[PDB]
């Protein structure tokens, strides 16, 4: 069954260059034309390069023409995209896509790799706990949570009690303010832990490595 | 290029009804061999886009017989009939007939449901935060429907503030409600001038604003 898996997106700076790759497995790659379609952070989809089954023919939109080269090793089945003079507009999830037999539409799509083009220097996060705060107030369940502040680029992963706290949580989309993001996540537990049992909150930030496990203890002051 | 307008941008519908998303090109998609290549793709919550209808009426294998596509020349349309909740996602229409192959804007299909009032939760700055001068008062409006919500900050009763972040979730797959977090940020010098912090939120479920608060000196 068709699988297309891509790798390469990292934080690149403007002026830069990256090369993303895509592995196919599950079908005779050499008879299928292939393509790299991209999803802009505003969710609108743009097609950026398309390639014939033998690597002879190469098609590009006017915006990437000149700066992106697409190619394919039909023997260790990989398809690629080498990206030169990047701009910030090129940020997005790049999708390795497989053209139909009837080559005008795509039938399978890869899982995607984010390329970020920016001049912000990466920063770790500061994770602070938010506890019921004032007098709690007792009525079976309580909302506790994390604030993950001041990191760049995305991603962070928020997990409660290593993954056992799995119901109740909500992990809000990140808002980017002045080149630094902020993200928060809540959790609703019955009132029996937090009292008795530990709620730790576990964020981790890939770019800078950084794992932080804060605990939600009751602040009173 | 060939602009593919798509309407409407967001479409509330309730399990059991019909949804028509429709897409339109400013140039014909009909090539001389009589093939009209307008395809319809689905981006579910979290995953990557799937082919559903391809070449205007045909259905790729595995797509339910409730996704049906019609139209010709320049106006095209998808009918999802008897909508079920695992159909929420963004529907994109596309055209491979001319290079470059363009895509439409997207249609979020939203599952309509009975209203739910929010659950406001307001948190005070943590002492940890304060030992570097920041102070961000977080407010959580977890668990509600419709998306449209009003949220205001008032410190001491007077004022209100700009210098805020608001972030909403998508429709929840097992629940169809939304959640949102509003963060109001101040400094230690600002936070220490004041006393009552308030989160004032309003929905369609209630005439008096839903209201959560704390009296500042629990740092």
């Amino acid at each position: 069954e068709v699988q297309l898996v891509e790798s390469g997106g990292d934080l690149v700076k403007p002026g830069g260059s990256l090369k993303l790759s895509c592995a196919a497995s599950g079908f005779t790659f050499s008879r299928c034309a292939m393509s790299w379609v991209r999803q802009t952070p505003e969710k609108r989809l743009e097609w950026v390069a398309g390639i014939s089954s033998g690597g002879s023919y190469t098609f590009y939109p006017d915006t990437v023409k000149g700066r992106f080269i697409i190619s394919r090793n039909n023997a260790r089945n990989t398809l690629s995209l080498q990206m030169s003079s990047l701009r910030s507009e090129d940020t997005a999830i790049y999708y390795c896509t497989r053209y139909s037999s009837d080559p005008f539409y795509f039938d399978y799509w890869g899982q995607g790799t984010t390329l970020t083009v920016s001049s912000a220097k990466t920063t770790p996060p500061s994770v602070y706990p938010l506890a019921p705060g004032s007098a709690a107030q007792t009525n079976s369940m309580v909302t506790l949570g994390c604030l993950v502040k001041g990191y760049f680029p995305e991603p962070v992963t928020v997990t409660w009690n290593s993954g056992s706290l799995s119901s109740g949580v909500h992990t809000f989309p990140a808002v980017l303010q002045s080149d630094l993001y902020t993200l928060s996540s809540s959790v609703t537990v019955p009132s029996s832990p937090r009292p008795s049992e530990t709620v730790t909150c576990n964020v981790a930030h890939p770019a800078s490595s950084t794992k932080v496990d804060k605990k939600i203890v009751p602040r009173d002051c | 290029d060939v602009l593919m307008t798509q309407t409407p941008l967001s479409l509330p519908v309730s399990l059991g009804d019909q949804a028509s998303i429709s897409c339109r090109s400013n140039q014909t998609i009909l090539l001389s061999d009589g093939d009209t290549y307008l395809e319809w793709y689905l981006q579910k919550p979290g995953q990557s886009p799937k082919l559903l209808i391809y070449k205007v009426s045909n259905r790729f294998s595995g797509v339910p017989d409730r996704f049906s596509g019609s139209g010709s020349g320049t106006d095209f349309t998808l009918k999802i009939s008897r909508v079920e909740a695992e159909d929420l996602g963004v529907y994109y229409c596309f055209q491979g007939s001319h290079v470059p192959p363009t895509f439409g804007g997207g249609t979020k299909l939203e599952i309509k449901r009975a209203d739910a009032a929010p659950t406001v939760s307001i948190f005070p700055p943590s002492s940890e935060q304060l030992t570097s001068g920041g102070a961000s008062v977080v407010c959580f409006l977890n668990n509600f429907y419709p998306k449209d919500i009003n949220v205001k900050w008032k410190i001491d009763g007077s004022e209100r503030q700009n210098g805020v972040l608001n972030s909403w979730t998508d429709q929840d797959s097992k629940d169809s409600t939304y959640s949102m977090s509003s963060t109001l940020t101040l400094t230690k010098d600002e936070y220490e001038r004041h006393n009552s912090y308030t989160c004032e939120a309003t929905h369609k479920t209630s005439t008096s604003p839903i209201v959560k608060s704390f009296n500042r000196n629990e740092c």
């Binding site: 034309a33 398309g50 014939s52 089954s53 002879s56 098609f59 080559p103 | 491979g96 007939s97 001319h98």
Partner: peptide, 7 residues
């Protein structure tokens, strides 16, 4: 060879 968007 299969070429995109050409029959």
């Amino acid at each position: 060879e299969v070429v995109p968007h050409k029959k």
